[PDB]
DNA sequence: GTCGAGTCTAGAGGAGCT
DNA sequence: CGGGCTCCTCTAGACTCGAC
């Protein structure tokens, strides 16, 4: 089964090759082989021996069509056929007029012609345009919603709106949500938010309803980069302003339809009001929501045909429909995780706040005698003082003495006529001190300067932080720094003479992003190595400084993410909603809690069509020194289920390599870059990541960043900054970029795609946004456009993987469902009986996707090196590595001990073949 | 000035200079706390009581007698009680009573009654503060919580109690890093850990948790298992006895070292004296009447007032302020002649030393709010 | 009877034989259970306030349980003997050494106060009069009996000694009658010391007899004399511009006997302890379902109450179910001031079913007003 | 009337992921 | 020209409203 190409690269096994590409094909010819051989000889890669990998023989599923592209097209058409049929119902539909007055009942109301209000259980429509309004005061619970469907207007009123009660259960349940559900298409402007509030979406078993998003299609069609939205808002080559807008509903409406400007409620009662206001201003809010739904439908009417014109391959839509059905399960350990993480966060915050407040209290004593003018850290604060503004005894004898004193006290307690109406806030304290303390009438008042924190601009002055013997100073123009007295004998970020501190030089703190950026806080993670090095030091001395930095690192993720994580809309399934497998499993906890979190992913939320999510796509990996980092590990499969998933090995590196190879000749490894990518293994430490990591001396995770940054338009400044940071030099950068070159063909292919009249992805031909085409921008945003070629090819890869995985799961009846897909990972919640079938399906999916990537480029083959995953994880909790134990500060005993989660197994292709007998059927 | 000298000066410590030595203070053979020291110890005992009984689910009070039954155990070193009239030697060791060395024996004696009180539902605990006698005779005030964990969750509850005790000891501390814990084992190899405080001479085990088994409970009950078997969940289980014993005399000494211008920055919920009242120039009679009324108002709300207006000895403001600082007075209230005109009184805070004016009507509410919000 | 009621409600403790009147008075065992300990703690706290917080120049005193010992013939208190010393021997010389050097247990708190006199004298700038108060355990032979004596040692000049004694007598009578359901059961009496010194005793009309719960003595300077045989200047206090050796007035009571007195006086079978003395003041239970949400409401209410110093009995945590009348009877036996019941209606509008022990009349109150009402009721009971 | 306190809103830097 | 996002806290600024 061994096969080798003309370049002696080991290719796909003959048994697999005869099924993927079939017998026959066209050889590249003698000239192409000569090109590749000379190119490899020039770079010295020709003479290297190749270690043969074991042969793989599989009975692959019968690919449909005449080739692989036809196979993928047929799969995607079958997948997304009902949802295009449902989507075309909205474009041609006509709506009856909006009712004069809305209903005040419970449940769903159907408004026929002339405003006839009829209560119904569910809309029961294949196509809906949806918007959900949530009273933020009552927590994360749907308040009211308006739906547009062909020939109907729908409104929904929650029981927490019609009925008035002292309190409701804080734990959400399916009975508290919107009942909205053989395929059905639900359209919304942020349809992830509208999906999260549906009761049928939390069931463990999958459902056929798919959600399409108007802002997703807006980003696909005419989206704007983050550097472009800034310019667009500031304004509101510039020919792109007329064909693009921010993802706001009104901004999109004024662009795609251009009718009368949309109106919003100025008060914002759903975000800035109470339930009483909503119950008293009900009609205005319902009308302003119906207006938004109508605007969304009108935008969709103009958006659907244009997206299909610019993204013609069925795989794009078939993958966009599937990427919006993410599903994260949780258990009662989620509440314990929240409680323990919050408790540890409060404990560490109090530990640092005690020291901070002690320094603040010992600081204000310098007011006496004006000693602050001598302090090297606090001489710049506000030390003003405010005046106070204005507009044995006998039993009978002792009783009289008591009464007289009490009356004398009571007399003065009535002398409040001179008291000003507004109580003055701490007139006797210094100016900087008042801002640190909440006012006495604050409902959340706590004694002392409770508002002080490490992020504040006074802390590095209170703690008397010192960088290499110099006190820290803040300049509004240049950020943090330090004052070197003597005003030039110090070497650093250069003395910025803008500050003009008398007798001192302002040197900026070294920053990881170079002298173009300004330091915001000296307590950044980057300074901990400099803290331990003895450069950054604290005034009180000892371990106070290092302990403060360590606590800041431990709680920094939780400080920014506790609002999101705590407010994650967890819905706990009752016992009647769980499947029989969870009920009957031995690990089932009869007195436990089971639920799920639906990520609010807005698919294609980037000009590169990447999905984005506030929390889950940015959730930190479990680390032994981060509070709450076990967040993903808290996503634990229910009893009887496993989280079978995999990671693509060097996804974008191999995509760029195959593009460069195909542009060169019809083989794999034609270019030096492609040959380097193919001849390597992560397990042996010789892949293109480690190959450069060893050369430069960094970790594999930093090697990824280095290589990807160098590929994606680093230029000369990035290389010179890296050289200066690593060796305290543009000639070396020129040498690196020169080494016709190793990666010249990939760059040529990317620039040919980018500068084309209508740039398209090489695989599926999805067009770029109208705001980035050469007709709209003359040679502008080049780095964003060239990066889009590979980064959106990665989204095409993800769409192909999702299509193939759904096809395999539905064809072989695997009892697993899509769980979550970070930008290159694909986690599947699979029942235990199907975990190895799922692993084999993932391996086959990766093989097919790599073969399709080769086929669309005309290579007609695939190497054995990249044909399969390194290993497919079979885990019970969502974590990066199956053998990793968290042992985070909020969970010191680990998943094995506290939460009782064992380790998993990472299985390569051969073990999966042995376990499944090389077959997916039972 | 040394901490011991300052505490003796401000009546936190008692005794002779020979009794103020480190070894003498650690021994416990003499009265070491003055009036303010006794008040601080009572405050610490009340904080421990609240945090370990009032806010803890199913923890109950118990009061044990100071003397254990007179059994002739050879290993016991406890002092014996002998009636002088009987004298006016084997029988003494045979039957004479002995002073208790730990509160565990009383907790185990009262274990049945507290089972009956809680309907025998495990888990539950007995908490007690009292004097325990140790051979050196030294006396220590032991605050011991004996938690009867079910055998299934012994280590889990042990870890929870270790974390809770460390948090409680660090809560009142100006330097939580000084309190630390380290796992230790006894002569019989029982698992456990000891809390410490980094005293200037070294770590002292202010609190120890011992993972005792069913043997320690069977010692006092050599009879039917059914009478001592707790109702853990659905199956009757002999509880796992954890001995969480904390020394509040050494705890108060630790907090006096931790709090320590010369100021004892004791926690607002620990300080013995919280409000100090003074007077202005004249007229004296009206100022004294106002101070008496204000003090009577404050005392009725539960705020420990120190009347400084009745002091006959004249002293400057600086001396008065330093005296109130060393005694850890939270606030000093000054009533002057201006108070009779508009009701404004000058208020000073120990933490910041900043003086601010406030109307006399709002003083009591401000103090109550400050003391209530300082606990959290 | 009261013995059964107090034992079954954990006011009393010990074996039934230990529940005899003589055993209770002797104090040779733990005679008070957790509720009895709470009631005695409340009584001690009220005494401390009435005679050390709301009093002038009265200070805390706390001293060792043991005494140095002087081999006096009248010292019948038990002695401390080290087991190691006995084991070393294993006889006249040994017994002589024991009687000469072994420390004895304290029988009264007077000597501890006299030992602490010097430091408290310095604290008050030697200004007479001033008092020393202490609550502690005293050891007396019946094994060994222990009494939780609460005593005040008042140092007053020779002038107005009898006046101060009468002042203290009337104030103690008023304080004991303040919490009394039947204040006529408390009576004062005249008495004379064995040395001819005058004094007074405070009785309580127990069903068996008028036990002395508190005793007053005009001891004079004789006690201060021995405790300090040294120079007079370290003994005499300041009276105005003069210096005089103060006369020592002994005002000593028994809070174990006082607690028994207040258990008998505060006696369906319902105890009517004073609100300032009752151990449990609020009982929080729960009605029908939803139990999961009503339990959260009760947890919130309980956390709100405990943060304001109100003792609460978490009855909602008990899995045993019984009729509401039985629960009310049990709470009355345990002297619960108010019984709070949270039901389904509480979720709808915040109204709870509030019951008062003194009236047996039910009420509906909003949740937000419960804390304020309880605090106001307790303050009104305390001030009046 | 003029001053002074609340109240959104914009930008900047840091921290997560890929 | 590393990219592409997400959200947070912190602070400067303009605007509004009430109080004397
Ligand atoms: N600093 C980074 C990190 C990642 N990526 C992109 C390129 C990758 O294809 C994709 C996924 O990131 P990975 O961390 O998975 O990178 P690799 O796939 O190369 O890692 P591995 O080979 O270990 O799977 O994200 C990037 O452009 N820049
Ligand atoms: Ca990867």
Residue numbers in the entry:
A (entry chain A): 68 to 248, 262 to 316, 344 to 498, 532 to 627, 731 to 971, 978 to 988, 1051 to 1233
B (entry chain B): 41 to 128, 145 to 192, 205 to 328, 343 to 458
C (entry chain C): 42 to 131, 141 to 192, 204 to 328, 343 to 459
Direct quotes from the study:
DNA polymerase γ (POLγ), the sole polymerase for mitochondrial DNA (mtDNA) replication, functions as a heterotrimer with one catalytic POLγA subunit and two POLγB accessory subunits. The POLG gene encodes the 140 kDa POLγA subunit, which possesses polymerase, exonuclease, and lyase activities, while POLG2 encodes the 55 kDa POLγB subunit, which enhances DNA binding and processivity. With over 300 known variants, POLG mutations are the leading cause of mitochondrial disease linked to a single nuclear gene4. Cryogenic electron microscopy highlighted structural differences between human and mouse POLγ, particularly in the POLγB subunit, which may explain the higher activity of mouse POLγ and the reduced severity of mutations in mice.
To further explore species-specific differences, we assembled chimeric POLγ complexes using mouse POLγA with human POLγB (mAhB) and vice versa (hAmB), then analyzed their conformations by cryo-EM. While R conformers resembled their wild-type counterparts, E conformers revealed key distinctions. To test this, we created chimeric enzymes by swapping POLγB, forming hAmB (hPOLγA + mPolγB) and mAhB (mPolγA + hPOLγB). Strikingly, mPolγA paired with hPOLγB exhibited a reduced kcat compared to the complete mouse holoenzyme, while hPOLγA combined with mPolγB showed a modest but steady increase in activity. Replacing hPOLγB with mPolγB increased rolling-circle replication, while the reverse swap reduced DNA synthesis.
